[model samples]
Structures are given as structure tokens and as C-alpha cells.
Target: MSTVTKYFYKGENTDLIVFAASEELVDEYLKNPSIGKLSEVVELFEVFTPQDGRGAEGELGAASKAQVENEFGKGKKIEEVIDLILRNGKPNSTTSSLKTKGGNAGTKAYN
Candidate 1:
């Protein structure tokens, strides 16, 4: 998850960060949570789109937040956290290529 820089996640209650650590972990992690696991797919470890300099991923982050919005809302961030680990836990090859694109239309973040 090196591509992921210092990012802040604002959830309903907690707003924390995950910068390349493999532990229990948010803005997207905050909003939807699956975006946290996005590392399994794209090179998000070092790929940040930049969200207004507050230091959270931009296009991906906001899109992620939307995922939560329809089911959650921004006071929240993509994909469904459960879907990511449920089918398969962490660090899976198939998951690594599971296409994690953040946007209003294409959001299926897995845990």
C-alpha cells in the first residue's frame, strides 16, 4: 500500500488515516471502507488523485464517499467494506485485479 500516501478518512463517528499499513483500518475507508482494500486492485498504494490538499484521494475518494452515500452518505467515502473481505479476505490475486474505479456510476469497493 505504498502508493497510498497519508490519507484522512472521515466516517460518521471516526475520521482516521491509513498510510501503507496492513492492520485494522479511512476518507474512503471512512465513507465506504472498501476503498481501504482498494490496494488489492490498482496501485493505489502510491496512486493518489489528490483531493483539495487536505490529503485524501480525490476522484477515487469522492466517488468512494458516494458509494456510502447511496447506502450511507460524506459525513462519511467506496465499495462495500463487507464485499471486499467476505468473498475472500485480504491479499488475494484475483482481488488484486478486481477493478476499483471510484465514481458515482462505477463503485463496487470490496473489503
Candidate 2:
């Protein structure tokens, strides 16, 4: 099954926040206030694809970072965000899990 992962961030200066659940799931959680507050928590924001699978430490990460930086004016590390996901057992401190489809066991899916 593919697991849906969410990304969220808060800016350092402004109340602006950014939150997304994969590119496809973007529309799912962006409107929520808790997720929206992420932009206000950090100066920058980004979401990374799973490492070593479809999204490694390259294009996917760069693209997400670029998009967020373009929209928010700061650059957040994808790795840091992933770490948060791992440590918290979910994205953005929310209980919502990224919806997934087909995938092998031990296979990482950032969807």
C-alpha cells in the first residue's frame, strides 16, 4: 500500500504557513488551520519524496523546495522535514496519514 505523507511548516517572521500531503494530496489538508499554521513556524518550507524509492535526494526534493521557496521566500531542508515525519510518526503533528495504494513491504511511499 502507498502511504500518504503530509508536510507542514511555520515561518519565523510571519504568520504565514504551508502544509501539503504529497503533491496529489495538496488539496486535502491545505485548508485546515492547524496545517496552515506550519508556514508561520519556520522561515522556509519543503516536502521530500521517500529516499531511495521514487523520490530520492534530488529532483523531487529540489522541486518541492523550489516551489515552496518561490511561494514563501525561504528554503527549508527536505531531510529535516522527513526527520520530523519519522520522529512524530506523522506529518505536521496531525493524525492523518497519507493515503497509499500498491507497494511492496518495506517499500517507502511518500504519497
Candidate 3:
């Protein structure tokens, strides 16, 4: 099974970030962390809307450092935001089926 942990930062009802990564990796970091930029360590599965006061449920893409900085103000470190997500954000784990086709069908049905 593939286990992924999702971190949701509720900056606002209209603006938020949902970061997804391997559960094992997050656990590993929890045990013994490293110092690096956000993108250097994990992939940005999602983030807040970009339409200048606009949206979610958009197409999935890797989030950019430039884009993520838009959330935290005043020269805040991007790394700090990620650490806060791991520390304070709500985290949920979901396991995916090994059978790609079956899982895909089941997942699509829900949405």
C-alpha cells in the first residue's frame, strides 16, 4: 500500500494550502529532521488560489517557492511554513490500493 500524509494549512477560508507527501517520509523527518528549503525536501501537491482573490478544486501541479511565499508575510522563511504545517496543521493519511486500475475507478467514483 502507498501511504500519503496530507498537511492542510487553513490560512483562511478562501486561502489555504494542502501539502501531500509520503507518510514514511514525514515520520522520518519527525524523528530526525533536516535543514533545507521547502521544495528541496518535498513536493508541493497543492496551494491556495491565485486569481487575485479567487479558488480551489483546480488542476494539480507542483507548487512553486515563489508562489508559496505569497502566504506568509514579512520575509518569513518558506522552510518555517512547512515546518509549521508538519507541527500544527491537520494531517491525515490515506492508503492507495496496489491495483492501479481498481483504485483509480474507486477514487474517480467518489469525486
Candidate 4:
């Protein structure tokens, strides 16, 4: 099953939700606020990591950093900012594990 990680911002008025396919996805999503439907509340600026697994290391993070630089032209330390946000933000909750069910007999389940 595909796992999803969600980040929350505990505000005085309302909580904000930021979701991604992985921790890196959340980081990438945070760097570019204008990419999704949730961008309206993008200024909330809090983050969280996936409870299921840790992020990729070395070349993966470096590659992500390079991609971000390529798109935004590397002015501010975006990765550093993301690290700080994750370090300080609180994890609100985790969803229950999703289960996959087998298809019925005679159905077109196979590719």
C-alpha cells in the first residue's frame, strides 16, 4: 500500500494540514507553496515527517536539493529552512495502515 505523510500547524485559530507522498515530498511541497490546491493556506509554514519510514539519504537528498536549486535558482538555503521547520514542528497524527483486498474471481484483476 502507498503511505502518505501529513504535517500540521497548530495555530491559535485553526490548524493547517500539509500532506505528501513522503517526507521529501512534504519538504518539496513546502518549498513551493503554489503547486497544489492547499496553497491558499501555504503561509502556515509548519511541517512533519512520515511515521512509517525515514527519508532517503546522501545522493537522494542532494539530488532533491539540486532540483530545487534548478527551479528556484538557489538564493536562500531552502533545504536548511525545511530542516528547521521539521525540527520545530509537531506531529499531529498518523493514519491507520491501508489494506489491499484481492479481486473477485473471473474479474479483470490481472494486467
lDDT of each: 0.37, 0.39, 0.54, 0.42
| Residue 68 lDDT in candidate 1 | 42
- Give each model a TM-score: 0.19, 0.19, 0.48, 0.28
Highest TM-score among the candidates is held by which one?
3
**Candidate 2, overall lDDT?**
0.39
**Where in model 2 is the C-alpha error above 4 Å?**
1-63, 67-73, 89-111
Model 4 poorest ten-residue lDDT run: 55-64
Query: What tens-digit string does per-residue lDDT give for candidate 4 at 8-78?
Result: 53433333234444565455655765334333323343333223334322121122344334433267464
Compared with the true structure, what per-residue lDDT tens digits does model 3 show for residues 12-109?
A: 43344555566666666777677553343367624534344333334434445565665663476656666766655655344345645344546545
Span of ten consecutive residues with least summed lDDT in model 3: 48-57
Best of the two (2, 4) by TM-score: 4
- The Cα error of candidate 4 at residue 109, in Å, is 46
lDDT of 4 at 28: 60
Please list the residue runs of candidate 3 whose C-alpha ends up more than 4 Å from where it truly belongs after superposition. Answer: 1-4, 37-41, 49-56, 60-71, 93-111
Model 1, residue 7: C-alpha shift (Å): 14
Select the stronger candidate by lDDT from 1 and 2.
Answer: 2
By the TM-score metric, which is better: model 2 or model 3?
Answer: 3
